[PDB]
Design a protein around this ligand. Structure first.
Ligand SMILES: [Mg+2]
Ligand SMILES: [Mg+2]
Lengths: 238, 238
């Protein structure tokens, strides 16, 4: 199966899991967005087939209960884009595959100018470009709701919710990418970027974090089924 | 089976489910506390055997990964009690049953004077008192993180996290209680109380909500597998 081929190195969690044609998603009934999504790219899979992104329509995934759905109206005039976790550009092999990347379960409220349309997209483009020199590539993407130290010396998680459905606006997003460079051996790259305007001059390497930090902040077990010795490079090191 | 006996009317969720001796719990790797607990009561099960709560100890359940565990040190000098979601006093039929209610998975950071020790406990006693005039009784309890409309006209969820493990301090707690009064006929009671000091003169009935508000706030499906026609009483009405 295509799902087992994607989820080969572990499910980060097993909450409300949905297997689409070309990616896997875990949906959070509370935040009205994803816990995480997982993708598998090969250089062959990054080659386009009469497939058209202009045909795609933002809509909910109605396999989830009605009361836990985000709707296009939650995102209208909110100040945020509907930002795709599993990117459209990664799924080019059928119309339905890419159509599904426009399901609102794969959307999180994202700052547009300076993030989604810019620095975040850069990180997506980086992964595809790197996926081209590798045998297999696996990417986990998802929202974070990170605590901050405030004035009174205590820590608070604060995040906006938008719309009547109260879809959560993540403070940050993570992205873990696992690239198979030679059979059995992998490069690992972990990122946490703020859901905020980032100046086009900042390089993505600056948002490098350990994989341990993503796991703790996200409440997720990432690439749990991969032997750590098979990793020959974490964030550009070793 | 006992878990099947407890979960007769439905799982609110399936996230990190741990079935203990006498209750069922869903743990949240992110908040370091529970999504929900489920309890079942009969008049028989509210009778004591030689079992003593003084024997119990606050510890984590190490069946959960270490990075997702809350520790006693997180609650120490935090301003909060270890508030049991599944109450010790609902579990009087064995020593192991009660011992388990002192797992940190069953604990949430709660205000002590005016809540845990005071208004929440009354609600706990209320459920027990009713459980005695009823054939069967089912209780779902869990924490909530509720958004607030602020001055800028935007909504935010904001909550404190305590300890080095960053355990969430919930904004509110819910409790839904399903009492079987005659065979296949039910009285439904739903509550939401704020994790705050509540004056002892407020009656618990003042915290009634529709079941829908609990489902929407918590992102859970409570008693979903129950015929609404089986319910003959909602929050004191009909
Ligand atoms: Mg995007
Ligand atoms: Mg208590």
């Amino acid at each position: 199966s295509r799902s087992a081929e994607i989820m080969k190195h572990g499910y980060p969690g097993f909450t409300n899991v949905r297997t689409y044609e070309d990616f896997v998603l875990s949906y959070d009934y509370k935040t009205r967005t994803a816990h995480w999504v997982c993708e598998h790219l090969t250089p062959e899979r990054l080659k386009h087939a009469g497939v058209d992104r202009k045909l795609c329509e933002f809509k909910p995934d109605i396999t989830f209960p009605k009361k836990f759905l985000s709707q296009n109206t939650d995102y209208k005039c909110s100040g945020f884009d509907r930002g795709h976790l599993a990117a459209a550009g990664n799924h080019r092999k059928s119309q339905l595959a890419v159509d599904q990347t426009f399901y609102l379960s794969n959307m999180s409220p994202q700052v547009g100018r300076g993030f989604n349309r810019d620095k975040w997209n850069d990180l997506e483009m980086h992964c595809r470009r790197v996926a081209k020199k590798m045998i297999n590539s696996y990417i986990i993407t998802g929202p974070l709701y990170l605590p901050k130290l405030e004035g009174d010396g205590k820590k608070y998680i604060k995040y906006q919710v938008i719309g009547d459905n109260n879809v959560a606006v993540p403070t940050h997003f993570f992205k873990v990418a696992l690239f198979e460079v030679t059979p059995g051996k992998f490069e690992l790259e972990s990122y946490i970027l703020p859901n905020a305007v980032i100046e086009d001059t900042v390089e993505i390497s600056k948002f490098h974090v350990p994989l341990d930090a993503v796991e703790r902040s996200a409440g997720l077990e990432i690439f749990a089924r991969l032997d750590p010795k098979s990793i020959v490079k974490e964030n550009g090191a070793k």
